[PDB]
């Protein structure tokens, strides 16, 4: 049982090489049609087989500033008290006030900041399998590191909010399974009450051979399929 066609195989091998040679490229296989029963099955499966030191679970709020060029400046807030403070303080604030606050934040362990270049990435769909393979550039802005000129707020930025409960399973030194309960909204109001969508991805930590990737994807498909 093979997942990739000959052309998909060759294109993915090039994507894997570009990922390994890149500075801030990420490689992700996104599984589609994940609903609540699938989410429950996947999460239960990985919790029982994964050693506790290799499980990470977090509740966090992502605030994405979407620019006219389609690129994104995203802040992830991991501190629960800070998430609550942000919501209460900015619930009725202007979008320009929110954007200015977002770009003013300094990164720390509880505040992750990334600039996502949505135009440099390659994304391919796979024939007859419900997955997409994506490579994308995500530059982390870290504490202590030299501050490079941040993007200018013009006032025409779009903002998106995603409240997430993520479970991350480090299956080996080179790959991690992320399963997430995501609440999405273009506004802050009643974000915690919007119906959840579910997302499942196999993200690389280091380059692996495509044959190893195909074996890992087959293992995940064996869990999600009835």
Q: What are phi and psi of 15, to 5 degrees?
A: -65, -40
Tell how far CA 195 is from the center of its chain: 19
- List the chain domain ranges: 1-226
Which method resolved this structure? X-ray
The sign one gets for the Cα dihedral 119, 122, 128, 129 is negative
Q: How far is CA 21 from CA 14, 15, 26, 39, 187, in A?
A: 11, 10, 11, 33, 38
> Could you give the CA distance from residue 68 to residue 123 in angstroms, rounded to a whole number?
21
The tokens describing 153, both together, are 């707020």
Q: How far is CA 78 from CA 75, 188, 212, in A?
A: 10, 17, 33
- The resolution in Å comes to 1.6
CATH topology classification for 1-226: mRNA Triphosphatase Cet1; Chain A (3.20.100)
Paired with 30 in beta bridges are 132, 201
Paired with 137 in beta bridges are 25, 117
> Could you give the CA distance from residue 25 to residue 203 in angstroms, rounded to a whole number?
11
Closest CA to 14 of 133, 126, 132, 125: 133
> Could you give the CA distance from residue 78 to residue 147 in angstroms, rounded to a whole number?
22
Residue 103 near residue 151, CB atoms below 8 Å = yes
Map residue 150 onto helix, strand or coil.
coil
Tell how far CA 10 is from the center of its chain: 25
């Amino acid at each position: 049982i093979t997942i990739f066609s000959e052309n998909e195989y060759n294109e993915i091998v090039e994507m894997l090489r570009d990922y390994s040679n890149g500075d801030n490229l990420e490689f992700e296989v996104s599984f589609k049609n994940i609903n609540y029963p699938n989410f429950m099955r996947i999460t239960e499966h990985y919790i029982n087989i994964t050693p506790e030191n290799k499980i990470e679970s977090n509740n966090y709020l992502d605030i994405s500033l979407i620019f006219p060029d389609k690129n994104v400046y995203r802040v992830s807030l991991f501190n629960q008290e800070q998430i609550g403070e942000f919501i209460t303080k900015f619930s009725k604030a202007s979008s320009n006030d929110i954007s200015r606050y977002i770009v003013s934040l300094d990164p720390s362990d509880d505040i992750e900041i990334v600039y996502k270049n949505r135009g440099s990435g390659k994304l391919i769909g796979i024939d007859n399998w419900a997955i997409t393979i994506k490579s994308t550039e995500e530059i982390p802005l870290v504490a202590g590191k030299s501050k490079i000129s941040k993007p200018k707020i013009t006032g025409s930025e779009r903002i998106m909010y995603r409240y997430k409960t993520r479970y991350s399973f480090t299956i080996n030194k080179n790959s991690r399974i992320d399963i997430t309960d995501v609440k999405s909204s273009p506004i802050i109001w009643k974000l915690m009450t919007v119906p959840s969508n579910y997302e499942l991805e196999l993200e690389l930590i280091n380059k692996i051979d495509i044959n190893t990737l195909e074996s890992e994807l087959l293992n995940v498909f064996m869990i999600i399929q009835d």
